């Protein structure tokens, strides 16, 4: 999709168990660890049965997420940052201006 670039400098809309993002219209973004969701309002848990599509599984739009189970949550979902993607944050959580 997009390029990464979108860098994170303030992210205090960022939750717990989020990792920090910004997007090229300016918002600072936040997204659920790989494996993680949505628990406590406007925040985020580990999430013991991570699907993808929804959430990417943890994942960002661009890291083409994979759907599995495994005895860590985080350790279920698999996020891939390509050639178009300058990083992958908290492994492909997002995709950052490099890092």
């Known amino acids: 999709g ?3 670039k979108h860098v994170c400098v303030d992210t205090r809309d960022i939750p717990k168990n989020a990792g920090c993002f910004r997007d ?3 918002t600072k973004e936040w997204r659920c660890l790989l494996g ?3 628990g406590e309002g406007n925040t985020c848990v580990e999430n013991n049965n991570p699907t993808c599509d929804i ?3 943890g994942c960002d739009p661009t890291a083409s997420c994979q759907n599995a ?3 860590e949550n985080s350790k279920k979902i698999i996020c891939t940052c390509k050639e178009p993607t300058p990083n992958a944050y908290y492994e492909g959580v997002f995709c ?3 890092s």
């Open 24 to 26: 090229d219209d300016g």
């Open 69 to 71: 189970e495994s005895t």
């Open 2 to 4: 997009v390029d990464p």
């Open 96 to 98: 950052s201006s490099s």
């Open 36 to 38: 993680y969701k949505k």
């Open 55 to 57: 959430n990417n599984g």
